[PDB]
Amino acid sequence: VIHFVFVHGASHGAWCWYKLTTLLDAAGFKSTSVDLTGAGISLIDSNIVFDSDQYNRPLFSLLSDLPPHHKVILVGHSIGGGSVTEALCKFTDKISMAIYLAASMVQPGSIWEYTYGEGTDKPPTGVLMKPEFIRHYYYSQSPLEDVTLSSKLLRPAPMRAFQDLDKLPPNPEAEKVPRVYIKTAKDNLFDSVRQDLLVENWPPSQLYVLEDSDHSAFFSVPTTLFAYLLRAVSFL
Amino acid sequence: VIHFVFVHGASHGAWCWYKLTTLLDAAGFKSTSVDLTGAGISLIDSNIVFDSDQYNRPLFSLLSDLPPHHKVILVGHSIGGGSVTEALCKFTDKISMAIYLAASMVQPGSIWEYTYGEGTDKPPTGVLMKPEFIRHYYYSQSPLEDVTLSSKLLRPAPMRAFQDLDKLPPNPEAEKVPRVYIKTAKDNLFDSVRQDLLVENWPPSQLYVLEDSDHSAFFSVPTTLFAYLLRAVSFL
Amino acid sequence: VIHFVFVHGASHGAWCWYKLTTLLDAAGFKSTSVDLTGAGISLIDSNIVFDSDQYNRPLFSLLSDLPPHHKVILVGHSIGGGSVTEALCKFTDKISMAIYLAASMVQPGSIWEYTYGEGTDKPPTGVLMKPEFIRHYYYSQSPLEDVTLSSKLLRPAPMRAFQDLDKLPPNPEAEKVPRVYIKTAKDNLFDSVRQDLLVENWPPSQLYVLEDSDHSAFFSVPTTLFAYLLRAVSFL
Amino acid sequence: VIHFVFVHGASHGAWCWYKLTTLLDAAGFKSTSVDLTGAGISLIDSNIVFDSDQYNRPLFSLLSDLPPHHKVILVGHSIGGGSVTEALCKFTDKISMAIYLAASMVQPGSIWEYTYGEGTDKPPTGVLMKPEFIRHYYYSQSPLEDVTLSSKLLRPAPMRAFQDLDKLPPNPEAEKVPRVYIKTAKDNLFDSVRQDLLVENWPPSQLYVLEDSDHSAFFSVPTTLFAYLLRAVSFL
């Protein structure tokens, strides 16, 4: 049985994958959606999450607890791509494929509201997109109800933790694991040029393009996204 | 402009009204969905919420900050009806109508996993329905993706706080506010008869019956629920 | 009970309202969707429909067979708006309200494939949009499955019948009936300026703007459209 | 590129496969959905289709127009299985695989409304399920809007033509072609036990079971069906 592990992006949570994993369940796949520390329904305030290793703990903890022979397919969205690659490097033997959905894919070896949990003279501890802008940047092609939903679940993102993502030494063993990049074509937040550049600097085994997706493929085009995942899996 | 305030039930949060408030937006209404303490994306652990007033703070706070002339229509689901009735008594002048959706409506004057936040020899501090039972009890008539959604969002409910709900002295002023009860007919958790019984013991201005709804009307029959709200609004 | 009657536009049929009437059914309204002659699953070839009254036969028959006191709300799409105005002129006593959804509403008194069922030297008998263009013009904001659906149901439209539409003598009785126009904001086929002009030249009781609708509001923004119809109903 | 050919069942048309072919498009497959004579948007009245080869004409013509080396995967639903088996025997060289979805698959060598197009003393020319029974029998597990859609698209079926389907002489060449049966588990029309019998009497290369599907898998469980098709293609 093939096991997906989904890693959300900044300010989001496991909740954002609800349409997608429901399909995969029905297709006989197992999916696990994590809440990174300070995200989703995590009891920890993201404003006290200053570390990459602390942010990724629920994901790393999950990969550690896998039985000796079990492997998973990692799927990351946006900044979640950083966590996927980091997890790709620490648990390489347990990853069969890494998928980057409009995500930060960086080879190992390479408007906003702010929260000042340590006072204003210190750099900000949390960042959150202002409510009046979330539709255009995150959900520009998504059903309106998903915007309502997101507006009640989005949490500030731990800025301090993001500064340490993807500062990794070259990893020849992780290079052997097949990667898949899925590009979002109508993404107002992660520009097409910036996505093409990630692909060019570290070409993946497969590349898909969601012609109609905004930043949030899991809301705007879940069935199409679903199809591409099964197709990437047929590859093995 | 008519202003609705939605109060979720046990283990749920503001997120559960995402389908309903979107319709109401299109209908020219304003809606506010609250996260009661320890629910939704509240940073406070529900296991330390031992008090009714502590649980209701986000709701009571919102009603306080209402402009001198502004009134709202309260809509409560399930145990949320208890918070509605209490808020109906403390902010009577600020409530134009109280709506009870498969909710506890008690006249002023009248399977589970447990968490032991004060050790196992003290009574439990939190209660949560086991994952294998939520589909049948909460969402038996709901889309599967809404079950998935809920499973990544349900948080333990503050049991101790619920013991104080609806222990209110008679309030003749609160009797003057028009009430509406909306009954869910295929509710596997709050049996149909008990709902009828609440209505009988304290007759509302109106009674609607969602013939096809499970416990979670906002997932299973949001458009019909939407329509009934519009009908209830037509009165005042 | 409030009764809606839906009249499709060129090449479409009753089938296109499937999302909308399902919502309306659940809200306790009655809806009837007709197939105009040569459309939907009509057994008659549209290339032999040369007459306005022939095309409208199914709509006219339904209004005729209406009980003495029963009224209906007419909702027309696109060229179907012409049929709405015509039926408004022949059955005023039976129409409580006429709604024009991105439809031709003209006051009484005021790329394509062609089929030549009568040879090439005679004027064309049928018109149908080329398959490669239906997505962009008809369904630019609509789900892909609906484009697929439409591609297996779209039939050529009877051009000859369209020339007699909205060629009506002034009707002061039809003027008393409340009209509502719903403008589609992202319509690649029926331009914004042209919609405003219909509104300017014959001001309706109400004006709605679907900020996110393509030409096919019933596919791209069905719930929002549903909400707007209930609103228009709230008046009379 | 792999080409699917979809054959609807009695009263249905190409329109019924709209969700499924959209998914397959996304997986990079080509699909063609046919309207058998008198079905879908066929201009021919089914009450004058008394003949099997006339009913199968749109399908047979399609297989005829296939380029010399090109093959297709035949997928039939319900009575469409008869057309599939028949096409399997007549165009064996053009079929790479035949798939039976809750369909009649019989080895070569082995409540209703009626229409009387030839008067009442002659046997009926058309059959159609009464409107009040289509939900339970066809769409017991399908979205309500698909029931609405179907109700405006279902056409009477040519009873007379059905008497000649699958009256075929043994075909050792057709036996070499790999078959797939996909069983519907919650089918109120083609009971689970009877489906098992077809498999027993003529064992397929593969057998899939849609645990949650009604008679109309293409409406009720499209993504799951989609997945099984991908699995079936994996057999090459």
Tokens encoding B112: 């589970």
CA-based end-to-end distance of chain A? 12
Closest CA to D128 of D159, D82, D165, D160: D159
Is C103 in a helix, a strand, or coil?
Answer: coil
Say if residue D68 is exposed, middle or buried (CB neighbours under 10 Å; 0-12, 13-18, 19+).
exposed
Of C14, C41, C145, the CB nearest to D41: C41
Interface residues of chain D, partner chain C, Cβ below 8 Å: 13-15, 18-19, 21-22, 25, 33, 35, 40-41, 43, 45, 144-149, 152-153, 155
* φ, ψ of residue A188 in degrees (nearest 5): -75, -5
> Sign of torsion, CA C42 C48 C54 C56?
positive
Q: Give the Cα separation of B47 and B54 in Å (integer).
A: 12
Q: Give the Cα separation of B149 and D184 in Å (integer).
A: 27
Count of domains in chain D? Answer: 1
Cβ separation of D148 and C25 shorter than 8 Å?
yes
**What's the resolution in A?**
2.8
Measure CA B76 to chain center: 3
Closest CA to D34 of D9, D10, D58, D53: D58
SS (H, E, C) C162-206: HCCCCCCCCCCCHHHCCEEEEEECCCCCCCHHHHHHHHHHCCCCE
Cβ separation of B40 and A153 shorter than 8 Å?
yes
Tokens encoding A175: 């290079």
Find where tokens 């009307």 sit. Answer: B217
Q: Name the β-bridge partners of A74.
A: A5, A98
Q: Give the Cα separation of A4 and A6 in Å (integer).
A: 6
D153 contacts in chain C (CB < 8 Å): 15, 40-41, 153
Q: Give the Cα separation of B111 and B190 in Å (integer).
A: 15
Size of interface A-D (CB pairs under 8 A): 34
Q: Name the β-bridge partners of D203.
A: none
Cβ separation of D15 and C144 shorter than 8 Å?
no
Of A226, A228, A231, the CB nearest to D223: A226
CA-based end-to-end distance of chain C? 13
Say if residue C97 is exposed, middle or buried (CB neighbours under 10 Å; 0-12, 13-18, 19+).
buried
A142 contacts in chain C (CB < 8 Å): none
> Sign of torsion, CA A169 A172 A178 A180?
positive
Q: Name the β-bridge partners of D100.
A: D76, D181
Specify whether A77 is catalytic. Answer: no
Element (H, E) at A141: none
Tokens encoding A79: 């900044």
Q: Which amino acid is at D223?
A: T
Cβ pair B114, B126 in contact under 8 A? yes
User: How many other C-beta atoms lie within 10 A of the C-beta of residue D234?
Assistant: 9
Element (H, E) at B96: strand B95-101
C28 contacts in chain B (CB < 8 Å): 224, 227
Q: Give the Cα separation of D223 and D229 in Å (integer).
A: 10
Farthest-apart Cα atoms in chain B, separation: 53
Cβ pair C166, C107 in contact under 8 A? no
Q: What angle do CA B188, B189, B193 make, to 5 degrees?
A: 80
CA-to-CA separations, D210 to C183, D31, D185, in angstroms, rounded: 43, 21, 6
> Sign of torsion, CA D75 D80 D85 D90?
negative
CATH code of the domain containing A28:
3.40.50.1820
Tokens encoding B74: 């309260």
Interface residues of chain C, partner chain A, Cβ below 8 Å: 144-145, 212, 223-224
Q: Give the Cα separation of C97 and B206 in Å (integer).
A: 28
> Sign of torsion, CA B180 B183 B188 B194?
positive
**Residues 6+ positions from C140 with CB-CB distance below 8 Å:** C186, C188, C214, C215, C220
Q: Give the Cα separation of B26 and C98 in Å (integer).
A: 20
Specify whether A234 is catalytic. Answer: no
Q: Give the Cα separation of B151 and B12 in Å (integer).
A: 10
Measure CA A115 to chain center: 22
Buried b (16+ CB within 10 A) or exposed e, B14-32: bbbbbbbbbbbbbbebebe
Q: Give the Cα separation of B33 and B41 in Å (integer).
A: 12
SS (H, E, C) A21-90: HHHHHHCCCEEEECCCCCCCCCCCCHHHCCCHHHHCHHHHHHHHCCCCCCCEEEEEECCHHHHHHHHHHH
Q: Give the Cα separation of C97 and C99 in Å (integer).
A: 7
Cβ separation of D212 and A23 shorter than 8 Å?
no
D28 contacts in chain A (CB < 8 Å): 231
User: How many other C-beta atoms lie within 10 A of the C-beta of residue B213?
Assistant: 26
Specify whether C12 is catalytic. Answer: no
**Residues 6+ positions from C70 with CB-CB distance below 8 Å:** C3, C94
Tokens encoding B201: 């013991």
From D187, D213, D214, D220, the catalytic residue: D187
- Gaps in chain D following residue numbers (C to N > 2.5 A): 110
* φ, ψ of residue A77 in degrees (nearest 5): -115, 135
Per-residue DSSP letters for B169-207? Answer: ---TTGGGS-EEEEEETT-SSS-HHHHHHHHHHS--SEE
**Residues 6+ positions from C87 with CB-CB distance below 8 Å:** C7, C56, C59, C60, C63, C74, C95
Q: Give the Cα separation of C11 and B233 in Å (integer).
A: 40
Q: How many CA atoms lie within 13 A of B198 on its CB side?
A: 25
Host domain of residue A30 = 1-236
Measure CA C75 to chain center: 7
Cβ pair C99, C180 in contact under 8 A? yes
Is A11 in a helix, a strand, or coil?
Answer: coil
Closest CA to B155 of A40, C29, D199, A126: A40
From B78, B140, B142, B216, the catalytic residue: B78
Rounded to a whole number, what is the distance in Å from the CA of C223 to chain B's nearest CA? 7
Per-residue DSSP letters for C8-34? Answer: --TT--GGGGHHHHHHHHHTT-EEEE-
Q: Which long-range contacts (CB under 8 A, 24 or more apart) does B67-72 make?
A: B70/B3, B70/B94, B71/B3, B71/B95, B71/B96, B72/B3, B72/B4, B72/B5, B72/B32, B72/B96
Q: Give the Cα separation of C52 and C166 in Å (integer).
A: 10
Chains with ≥3 Cβ pairs under 8 A against D?
A: A, C
Measure CA A107 to chain center: 16
Q: Which amino acid is at D46?
A: S
Q: Give the Cα separation of C103 and C75 in Å (integer).
A: 9
Farthest-apart Cα atoms in chain D, separation: 53
Element (H, E) at B77: strand B72-77
Measure CA C67 to chain center: 24
Find where tokens 């200053």 sit. Answer: A50
**Residues 6+ positions from B172 with CB-CB distance below 8 Å:** none
